[PDB]
Design a protein around this ligand. Sequence first.
Ligand SMILES: CCCCCCCCCCCCCC(=O)CSCCNC(=O)CCNC(=O)[C@H](O)C(C)(C)COP(=O)(O)OP(=O)(O)OC[C@H]1O[C@@H](n2cnc3c(N)ncnc32)[C@H](O)[C@@H]1OP(=O)(O)O
Ligand SMILES: COc1cccc(CC(=N)NC(=O)c2ccccc2OC2CCNCC2)c1
Ligand SMILES: [Cl-]
Ligand SMILES: [Mg+2]
Length: 385
Amino acid sequence: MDYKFWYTQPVPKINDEFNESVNEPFISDNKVEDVRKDEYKLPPGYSWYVCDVKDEKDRSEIYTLLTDNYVEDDDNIFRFNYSAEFLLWALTSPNYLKTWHIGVKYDASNKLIGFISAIPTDICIHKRTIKMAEVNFLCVHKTLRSKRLAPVLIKEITRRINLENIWQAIYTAGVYLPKPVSDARYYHRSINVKKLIEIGFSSLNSRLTMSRAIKLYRVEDTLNIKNMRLMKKKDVEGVHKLLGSYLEQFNLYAVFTKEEIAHWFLPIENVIYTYVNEENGKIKDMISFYSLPSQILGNDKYSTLNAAYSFYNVTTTATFKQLMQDAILLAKRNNFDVFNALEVMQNKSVFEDLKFGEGDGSLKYYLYNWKCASFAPAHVGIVLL
Ligand SMILES: CCCCCCCCCCCCCC(=O)CSCCNC(=O)CCNC(=O)[C@H](O)C(C)(C)COP(=O)(O)OP(=O)(O)OC[C@H]1O[C@@H](n2cnc3c(N)ncnc32)[C@H](O)[C@@H]1OP(=O)(O)O
Ligand SMILES: COc1cccc(CC(=N)NC(=O)c2ccccc2OC2CCNCC2)c1
Ligand SMILES: [Cl-]
Ligand SMILES: [Mg+2]
């Protein structure tokens, strides 16, 4: 593996390893003045297109592109299916720029064939808070793959981010690239055991018959934290303090403003669910997860896998095991087939006791133009969508 594009970028080489005492950009003293003002060149017959994610039809174009062409599991049985409403929520956070929502259309058909996006946030890395772009939803149409279009998207968004005097980015991928700061396996907790078997997500054996697997995964419809309820506006100050205080321990975390806590946590049906425990006017516990269905490719019975992805979970009145058991319950009450989590923060500590299964791969975390020590994923305290 040669990394002919990645080698030219301010990111570590495959073999670089830095001490905890290094925590700085690869390239500093950057000047907005010097950034190229011209758009990167596309191949003949393709054009940059500014996507207006707040316009239903533009948002729908992105939706269709990703639905057809976005990330599949290692075996090509599932494809991520972010909803249009999810996209809206994901891309219009506080201080977002419409111009970091970058499509490429094929001129002859006026069809969107490429996409990349970023939103700005404060990122704390080894106790240094830096303004960064959070990049996501890079996608080239399946019929246009391995044509070196992705580097053009990446260079173009880097240029536009740099124009705002931002010089660092954070991103995740399942692929290995120069060079992860941390690497987090994913795990799955079955809710609807029978569906998961029928679609090949999960497995049975002579010792685990269907009826026993169903019994293994059954959950009691009663919360450990009795008063856990959907978050409301009035809980924003309390979540900001609970979640903020919690995150300061990790090597890698977003430093949320109150405005960002409202945007990121206030519940939206089929998008984001946040539950809180309020005691004496204080928010003492919180659970949150987001909805990311997967399209099931060619299963005769089921087209969609409804899945909850653990976002941020904090307890002060219960055990973390108890809190995450409540999170599984709340996901079941909301019709999800499965609860997914990565081995970040304290999550790994509860996976065995709560009957999570190890998945088949891992999610790599990346920083652009930042040089530091890598670390085990328990020290990661940010979950990207
Ligand atoms: C200061 C601001 C900085 C901002 C920018 C920050 C950086 C953000 C960077 C992006 C973060 C996005 C995070 C995110 O969205 C979440 S990760 C999931 C990304 N999307 C998908 O996997 C969807 C399915 N695949 C596709 O649409 C295509 O396969 C893509 C578009 C992935 C590559 O299209 P292609 O037709 O398969 O390939 P070529 O055009 O020929 O290009 C090949 C080159 O691209 C490198 N490549 C492959 N996958 C990559 C990936 N996931 N990140 C970065 N680079 C990736 C690859 O190593 C090679 O470079 P090399 O030759 O050096 O190896
Ligand atoms: C079940 O259907 C699919 C479809 C496509 C790919 C995969 C495997 C996967 N790569 N999972 C995660 O990345 C993952 C697992 C647990 C928690 C978070 C995960 O990734 C999130 C979604 C994509 N971007 C980063 C967060 C499964
Ligand atoms: Cl209850
Ligand atoms: Mg390409």
